[PDB]
A paper describes a structure:
Carbazole 1,[name] (CARDO), a RO member consists of catalytic terminal oxygenase (CARDO-O), ferredoxin (CARDO-F), and ferredoxin reductase. The mononuclear iron site activates dioxygen for reaction with the substrate, and the Rieske cluster transfers electrons to the mononuclear iron site during the catalytic cycle. In the present study, we determined the crystal structures of the reduced CAR-bound Oxy:Fd complex (Oxy: Fdred-CAR), oxygen-bound Oxy:Fd complex (Oxy: FdO2), and both CAR- and oxygen-bound Oxy:Fd complex (Oxy: FdCAR-O2) at 1.95, 1.85, and 2.0 Å resolution, respectively.
The structure obtained from air-treated Oxy: Fdred-CAR crystals during CAR-soaking seemed to bind with both CAR and dioxygen. The Fo-Fc map obtained during the course of crystallographic refinement of this structure showed a large residual density beside the nonheme iron, suggesting the existence of a dioxygen species. We refined the dioxygen species as described in the subsection “The Oxygen-Bound Complex Structure”, and the O–O distance was refined to approximately 1.5 Å. In chains B and C, the locations of dioxygen species were similar to those of the dioxygen-bound NDO-O with indole (side-on fashion), which indicates that the average bond lengths between mononuclear iron–Asp333OD1 and –Asp333OD2 were both approximately 1.8 Å and bound in a side-on fashion. In addition, the electron density of CAR was not found in the active site of chain A. The average distances between peroxide O1 atom–CAR C9a atom and peroxide O2 atom–CAR C1 atom were both approximately 2.9 Å. Structural comparison of Oxy: FdO2 and Oxy: FdCAR-O2 demonstrated the possibility that regulation by the substrate ensures that reactive oxygen species bind to the desirable position in an appropriate side-on fashion.
Author numbering:
A (entry chain B): 1 to 388
B (entry chain D), F (entry chain F): 4 to 107
C (entry chain A), D (entry chain C): 1 to 389
E (entry chain E): 3 to 109
The structure:
């Protein structure tokens, strides 16, 4: 939908839609915060896919309104005026909207206005699952949340805990950094490696039967769409890094086996199993905020049968996992993403990049995302759709 | 039930004629060739008077922001318009054009 | 002239020139500072309509030169060198200009140069009135200042006192907010309303026809161009704000009636009378500095027959009107203007805005501005007008 | 190639290549730091002509690799990893290159990769001379260093000392400010003038025989291309600055004669002789870093026959010449350069500038640079050259 | 093992490409330009793309990944971002049968 | 007063000739077709010599910045030139070109 120079899109015939999706994919569910972060009657602002939104909790249920008055385009959040439980009144000329359907139900500055009941502020579906707030940034009735979530994230027994933050890089650079088989080289000195006695090679190199290591999923019953990188089951572990034949670096020879299988799913969520411990799983999203930033929504799952277990897990999370894994391990992924910004900033990195064997999995992802995304977000979606 | 607008002959094809009604919102009568149509005069996207716009075939273009509507269906034809225009019934009885007091 | 995407200008047929006037209107007088701010032989810098200017006072009189040397385009003000009372010498290669006509009269580094007396630095007319400094940002002979000021501002007995500052929003957003009949809602909690017992509705339910909502003045004895907001003529003031039939807010039921008449005038000055008190008036300009900023030049006028009344007024102004009205009331206008920046920054809000009834006032202003402005300032006027045969 | 609006380039027929060379000229030697600034195994980063580079010293020799991994385009310098003495390993996926030829010799994350030995990271020749590090930002076998250095810089006894810094102005504004005969007016109050008893007029103006003051050099045996502004011998010294015939400022009447001859040479190095003392020379480069910044590489040369003289000169340099001349004199050149940024930033200044007689020297330079430069650096050179069959 | 049997000359239409897989070695690409046959490595030198999956225009093969291109006769780059020459393998037709060399030309 | 410049045939069509004058600013004589015109030689926008510029019909283009003038009126034809050029009437008698001693 024209976000990139046409000359570049013409060059990347294998995945032009993906290269063009600088603002992300429209018509998909995206996690933006945790349930505990949004309280009853306290609207919270955020930007998703370039759009400013407002989220409010009313009678325990979440509602989402575009944070931009229909009148003069100001953000309602500049000065929040929720004068009745079910509505929000713009601070400027008092146009009032219902949280449930966005209908302009009243205008305090002119209760006789012909606009009343005849205009509607954009609303977006909101759903809470596993203590995470998901917003369907799309049009029409939303598909099942499961379609845009990795396998097992929604298991009844699966206890989800995590953290979220804003990172300065396009979402795609985050995705590819995460689903990259050979990038773990940057984690070779992470405190998680030693402090958790992990077995971690310098690089999971491509085995022989390539299409046996990569598994494209487009037959998932709930509609999921993604790609598996079967490094542990079909890939090769490089534990001794050599230069000129001499060993200059070694991987970690710990006892804990992790990262058996990695998978990337639309709209942009990675699943690492098992990780950071053999009895856990990591699910992380790279949510588009605008063309230069994304939410790095990290979650760790661990089956729990009772509160006593949930509490224990919650304690380990706070004292070990979050500090040693989400931060100790993944922090290097943050500046790694930032490091690729300049090369791709002008969109030319998508042409000049020189890929090697382990990037085969990334290429598969680009084609899958290009073929199965539910829409390309455009700046026009942000300012107001245009058509003659 | 109906109101006298004008003589079908006073309107050249492709022209617009505003119909002010006592105690109510104005309407716009369009002559697209030999057929006459009617919608509310006020653009649903704001407060502009469509009778001051430009008629291209059966599509009316608002003077304020360039939004447009199909004068036959009242459906939006060009952004930023999104809200259907109210359409009124018109009748040319004895070379004279009449517009329904209420919208169909 | 070519400041906005041509596709957008094509869509706004009712006021394309106004939408294109991002840098403001050329050939109009604009206030930029108060007389007391510029002293004899003390050149002052400022940017107006995107142009860097220098103003100096010589023998009591003000002169304005473009703050850009003709030679290599540097600002003379980087290092001011006024070597004679009537000239200014560029710090770079010493090109010297007369404040009076901008003529290049000498070049210290080459007294025999053929450029001497053959080049001229742009000058603009400057006039002081009511303690305010106005600059005619235009070409050729200027019209009377009266043409570009609201009625009565120049009245002999009118005592003017004010405040000026730089605000971060395009000048038009400032103009529209000030003339906006329904924006009165943002002032509902102002300290002025309570502390000065003002009557202030939340808005108005329009009455009468479209034409009765405003009164356009296409010509004054001096050629003024403006529009009066007459929404209160047949409109019903709203004192009780309801949502779903329930009262959620009330206007202010004070005894003092102000803002009986509000008018906006080209090049962009609002007159509110009477305000903030029944016996005074407010005249405020929204002066274009560049595409993203303007001077919010506020003034309060009050008829004063002698020196005793003037002194008394100056005391009331400093101790009450300036802090309670100019700041206490208008500060909310400042962030409201800033709140509209994003929507109009890409020029698309001029197409996507959804107006309602009271906006008839703004529409009348956009059309009047479009039909009677004296010229559209372009980026080319700033860098140097362009033309190729 | 495609650096400036074609409409502007068409207007400056006399020196389009020069105006288009916003990023500098490719295929020339450029100094970027002093030798003592780069030690053994201490990788240093720098941006030259818009390209991020890495320089390292191995076994005493300097090597230069483009600071950009061939794989995903990250700067290797974000987390330097030199595993072996002769290589550098990208911190991301471990692609490993040799400093000597840039060849991708190993890939720790995949030793069986077909890319190994089949890719080559860009390398640039580097050579140290007079304690200065020069990088040939070009392709193919480099020409002799002497071609891109002013006469005498490479003399056997010429002892070179200096200072370097990053200045916020395009390199061309720096070049023209330096080779500008009338700009010394900005140096009239420099401490160097009095503190070193210099004779310095307010400006050297055009003598009588124009073609005779400027000397275009394109017949030098070593191939260097430049222009001399023969001010001392053919130029006229202006000591009495007048406005309206009245003396308002005078130059300096010191005994020390300096700046007899000044010359600018490609790729952009000025030679002032003698300066800042009758027995010294000043050689300064304005090295393009990106379109908005440059290295102001200052050097002062003074013959020294032995270590005792060199040590003496070094002490004089630190106690006098550096603080009094390089800083005390040229600091004004810095803000002068910065003052021209706005006028030329949009590339319009190259059309709207109003030149006078002394700029004749600058015009000659613009033409010579346009005709003898060895290549126009473009954004494509920075991102990766493009070409469709 | 010096010459590899690919297919019958008639099995290939002008302007088409065929990939030749080899045990223990990188794949090759055979191109038919008119009635002439040429061959190079199948893997684009700029990455991991298969040129046999690209578009042939005359004697120039265009890579499907980034649009780079090569001259199939010389193996030299024809379009950016390609900069590394492809190895070229001699092709000969013996009795209407296409054969591609097992070793690339030296130069 | 009049200055004998040269023979008409000394100049090919569409060419410019610089005429130096001791103690005075040089002039430029342009041959447009078979007609002749004269102006000051120095561009009013700088130090460029118009005689080293490009003549397009009756408009001379400065070699420095693309500014231009109409050699007949001397008025600016293209920016950045804004100051009118000095014009000098010219007469051709007996195949000899003469230019007015002073501007007029
Ligand atoms: C390979 C091995 C481990 C990981 C990976 C790729 N990507 C990841 C993202 C988050 C946490 C762990 C990993
Ligand atoms: C004229 C006279 C002196 C100088 C000059 C131009 N340009 C210079 C640059 C550095 C130091 C001295 C000079
Ligand atoms: S901008 Fe919100 S009510 Fe006017
Ligand atoms: S008011 Fe008609 S398109 Fe906006
Ligand atoms: S820039 Fe002012 S005299 Fe040169
Ligand atoms: S970006 Fe350097 S090895 Fe991958
Ligand atoms: S892999 Fe062939 S052009 Fe990049
Ligand atoms: S010197 Fe002639 S156009 Fe500038
Ligand atoms: Fe990672
Ligand atoms: Fe206000
Ligand atoms: Fe200087």
């Amino acid at each position: 939908m024209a976000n990139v120079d046409e000359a570049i899109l013409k060059r990347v015939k294998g995945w032009a839609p993906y290269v063009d999706a600088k603002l992300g994919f429209r018509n998909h569910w995206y996690p933006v915060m945790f349930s505990k972060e949004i309280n009853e009657g306290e609207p919270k602002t955020l930007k998703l896919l370039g759009e400013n939104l407002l989220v409010n909790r009313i009678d325990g249920k979440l509602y989402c309104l575009k944070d931009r008055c229909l009148h003069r385009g100001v953000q309602l959040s500049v000065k929040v005026e929720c004068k009745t439980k079910s509505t929000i009144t713009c601070w400027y000329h008092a146009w009032t909207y219902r949280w449930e359907d966005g209908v302009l139900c009243d205008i305090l500055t002119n209760p006789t206005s012909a606009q009343i009941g005849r205009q509607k502020l954009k609303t977006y579906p909101v759903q809470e699952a596993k203590g995470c707030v998901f917003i369907y940034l799309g049009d029409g009735d939303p598909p099942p949340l499961a379609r845009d979530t990795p396998p097992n994230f929604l298991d009844d027994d699966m206890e989800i805990l995590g953290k979220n933050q804003i990172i300065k890089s396009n979402w795609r650079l985050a995705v590819e950094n995460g689903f990259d088989p050979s990038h773990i080289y940057i984690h070779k000195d992470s405190i998680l490696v030693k402090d958790n006695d992990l077995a971690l090679p310098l690089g999971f190199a491509p085995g022989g039967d390539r299409k046996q290591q990569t598994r494209v999923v487009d037959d998932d019953v709930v509609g999921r769409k993604g790609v598996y990188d079967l490094i542990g089951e079909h890939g090769v572990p490089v534990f001794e890094g050599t230069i000129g034949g001499e060993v200059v670096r070694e991987g970690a020879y710990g006892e804990k086996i992790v990262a058996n299988d990695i998978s990337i799913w639309l709209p942009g969520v990675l699943k690492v199993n098992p990780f950071p411990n053999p009895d856990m799983m990591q699910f992380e999203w790279y949510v588009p905020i605008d063309e230069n930033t994304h939410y790095y929504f990290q979650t760790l799952g661990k089956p729990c049968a009772n509160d006593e277990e949930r509490k224990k897990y919650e304690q380990e999370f706070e004292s070990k996992w979050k500090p040693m894994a989400l931060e100790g391990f993944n922090n290097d992924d943050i500046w790694a993403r930032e490091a690729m910004v300049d090369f791709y900033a002008d969109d030319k990195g998508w042409v000049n990049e020189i890929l090697f064997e382990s990037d085969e999995a990334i290429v598969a992802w680009r084609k899958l995302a290009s073929e199965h995304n539910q829409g390309i977000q455009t700046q026009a979606h942000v300012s107001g759709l245009e058509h003659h | 039930i109906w109101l006298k607008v004008c003589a079908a002959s006073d309107m050249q094809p492709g022209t617009i004629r505003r119909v002010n009604r006592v105690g109510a919102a104005p309407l716009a009568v369009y002559r697209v060739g030999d057929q006459f149509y009617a919608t509310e005069d006020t653009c649903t996207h704001g407060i502009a008077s469509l009778s001051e716009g430009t008629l291209d075939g059966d599509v009316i273009e608002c003077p304020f922001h360039g939004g447009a509507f199909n004068v036959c269906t009242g459906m939006p034809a060009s952004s930023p318009c999104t809200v259907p225009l109210g359409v009124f019934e018109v009748e040319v009885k004895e070379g004279e054009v009449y517009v329904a007091g209420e919208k169909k």
